[PDB]
Ligand binder design. Structure first.
Ligand SMILES: NC(=O)CC[C@H](N)C(=O)O
Ligand SMILES: NC(=O)CC[C@H](N)C(=O)O
Ligand SMILES: [Mg+2]
Ligand SMILES: [Mg+2]
Ligand SMILES: [Mg+2]
Ligand SMILES: [Mg+2]
Ligand SMILES: [Mg+2]
Ligand SMILES: [Mg+2]
Lengths: 443, 443
């Protein structure tokens, strides 16, 4: 209980809060909201504010259906940069059906659903440590994004410098003032690319922070004349952006992946997890990489995984194990990209993990200096399968899987599939310039 | 009441008001005004101010006509901007004849007429909850509007951010801190499109607030290098704008549409009232949808209605019943667009409602699924009539309906048709570029 009804009412008043953002999330991970005047804080709470909950199905809407917003008290945040006529605060909300029950088509209420599965298996927490990467492109005259990069930095370089446009700085600083907890940040591999890493938190809080963070970013960036994009593959020839997800299970407030007396100090619990992840990656990919362009980042030549394997020391492991042990033992899934919706991502991932533990699945041998050089044939002769090559591919595999379809639930699943199938069809029917360069003179 | 003579005179002096706007509306909903120096406040308040009330006719104006301006103390507000050589305030007004009686051709006086009509039927209040949607475009260098939108947001998604322009916010903030009572706001389907929704009120107050809204909007957006418009379909191939009106009747301070032990918890009255809107839609469309361009929004595929029908959950029903009951039990007409003169629309709607209540009309089958596919023929065999395709058609239907004509008033009616027929006549003789593109080389 971070705040209570009164603590918030007291707080709204102590400060000059005048505008309330009741923010949620549609199925495509897009960050939505309905805004009220502070004069509606009461109705807001009391969970009495209604809206067209079909905003959640995204562009595949069809009819208008009324739904309730239920604000999550302990997610109460006051935005800093505000203060014009008054300040602005917010609430992340859970969408309820008009009859009282939570709306099953809501991404957030789904994570919770599967977190009940985790607790019934006997676990207390499922932690996440996101490593979200993003590009900074320059704005032009007419305030339009351009293909020009904010800087020419390389890997863990000393990016932009402490003389203005240091977006990373203000971002990290602003986030820390908003109550976040950052672990560290750094410039990434390509020029004009960045990464800020959050401290670990419980699935929900971590997912909620990832949403805010993206928002916070986009804003500060515009403030500096820049464009932030979390597009996975903005530029052919340059690195893409992914969002590795460090994962851990807890039991009685004790880390469960750690076993000092076992191979790699990794519990049997830990290894079943890895096991399930390997079993389901080619199937949960259409979710952790939800866009067409997500697949342009998933190619040889960069640090992105193109095959299902794990390792503690390799070029592009879809699963990795950081060095830290004990209270910090965790599995890192390095295929997830920032285009992915966190609640859904952690839904399918948490689910594929539990499917390993439930069924004492057996993990394969850790890969190490092989995958990349051995032809897809040699790789294939082993547990080494290629991830889907296109969104259409990822979608077939997804549907085939029963434990992944369950991870969403009939509503979240029907529509996701619908929207993505359109997205692909639009792309497939499209005639790109590249083809005209190739065939228009040659034929 | 709310304000009394001396209360106002105290307010003006203390707040340092120096410029009064005597505000009113013409047939085309356009917002007129005669403006006096604070020093003339007395003359004003004694109902002694005169002006050319033929301004009410709009461009159909032929001869001049001296009329009086009667301020309404309860509509007194002080505009928040202003404060140069002093502050500004307005008074919404009723137009009188030089012989002391209210001028009929005045739309505000017209609704007050049909309202009294309602009371004879023994009703207490007529409530409106409007949801006015608008587009924000950019102003060019010359300060001239362009076809460039203010953002790329969609339905309900949190956009734009709290750093910069954020018109919607600054509008609601101004409205709220200016006496208004807003419920919520949000981004709309099309990029650059926005909607603010106010708490319900009685017809007159609700119509006055709609006229003040538009203004405050138009104003705020201009202040941010933007152009607001309530033009129904500014752009082909994107969503148009509309102003669904949420209607409810009270009897002795109690909602008369509600009824627990009923079906859908809708009272017999409700069912009848609905019945009325059903049989007058095609004949009141010309009023709720007054511009030529209004009918370019009335095309299938964009959430806007096209047939006379009512549902509780459908793609784009002319009428729909939102979830809430009890006090919130209401009928929503989704035909109405912003271009419409709120006073005329509300009066033509109240009138059609009461008519169906008066003559105990039998409401038709609520539409299940599909009015889109179910072709003309079939749609007919189900008593589903199409709205008028063009302003012309709309007029021929309005002119045929005895009760609708009576809702307007001999004067209002005569001049409204006069305007619309010339408006249509122009648009019909115009040779648009589209014709040239399709025909000039073809023939
Ligand atoms: N973290 C990194 O070094 C870059 C990883 C890469 N962006 C994936 O995809
Ligand atoms: N109800 C909505 O928000 C859709 C509005 C849409 N622009 C219309 O014409 O009705
Ligand atoms: Mg559906
Ligand atoms: Mg990194
Ligand atoms: Mg990593
Ligand atoms: Mg005349
Ligand atoms: Mg709307
Ligand atoms: Mg509506």
């Amino acid at each position: 209980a971070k705040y209570t009804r009164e603590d918030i009412e007291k707080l709204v008043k102590e400060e000059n809060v005048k505008y309330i953002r009741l923010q949620f999330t549609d199925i495509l991970g897009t960050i939505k909201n309905v805004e009220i005047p502070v004069s509606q804080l009461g109705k807001a709470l009391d969970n009495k504010v209604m809206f067209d909950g079909s905003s959640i199905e995204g562009f595949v809407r069809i009819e208008e259906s009324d739904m309730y917003l239920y604000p999550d008290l302990n997610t109460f945040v006051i935005f800093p940069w505000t203060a014009e006529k008054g300040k602005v605060a917010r609430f992340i909300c859970d969408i309820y059906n008009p009859d009282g029950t939570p709306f099953e088509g809501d991404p957030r209420n789904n994570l919770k659903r599967i977190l009940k599965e985790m607790e019934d298996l006997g676990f207390s927490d499922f932690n996440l440590g996101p490593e979200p990467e993003f590009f900074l492109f320059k704005l032009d005259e007419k305030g339009e994004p351009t293909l020009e990069l904010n800087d020419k930095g390389g890997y863990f370089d000393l990016a932009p410098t402490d003389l203005g446009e240091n977006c990373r700085r203000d971002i990290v600083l602003e986030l820390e003032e908003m109550g976040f907890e950052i672990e560290a940040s750094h410039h990434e591999v390509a020029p004009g690319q960045h990464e800020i890493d959050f401290k670990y938190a419980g699935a929900v809080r971590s997912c909620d922070d990832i949403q805010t963070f993206k928002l916070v970013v986009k804003t500060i960036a515009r403030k500096h004349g820049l464009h932030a994009t979390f597009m996975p593959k903005p530029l052919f020839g340059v690195n893409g952006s992914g969002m590795h997800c460090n994962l851990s299970l807890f039991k009685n407030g004790v880390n469960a992946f750690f076993d000092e007396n076992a191979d790699l100090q990794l519990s049997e619990t830990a290894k079943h997890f890895i096991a399930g992840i390997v079993k389901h990656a080619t199937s949960f990919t259409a979710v952790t990489n939800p866009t067409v362009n997500s697949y342009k980042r998933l190619v040889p030549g960069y640090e992105a995984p193109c095959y299902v394997a794990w390792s503690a020391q390799n070029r592009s492991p879809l699963i990795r194990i950081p060095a830290s042990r004990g209270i910090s033992t965790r599995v890192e899934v390095r295929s997830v990209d920032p285009a992915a919706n966190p609640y859904l991502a952690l839904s399918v991932l948490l689910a594929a993990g539990l499917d390993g533990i439930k069924n004492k699945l057996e993990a394969p041998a850790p890969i190490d200096r092989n995958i990349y050089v051995m032809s897809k044939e040699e790789r294939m002769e082993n547990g080494i399968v290629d991830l889907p090559a296109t969104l259409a591919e990822a979608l077939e595999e997804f549907k085939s899987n029963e434990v992944m379809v369950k991870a969403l639930g009939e509503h979240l699943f029907e529509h996701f599939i619908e929207a993505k199938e359109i997205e692909w069809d639009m792309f497939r029917t499209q005639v790109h310039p590249w083809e005209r360069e190739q065939y228009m003179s040659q034929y």
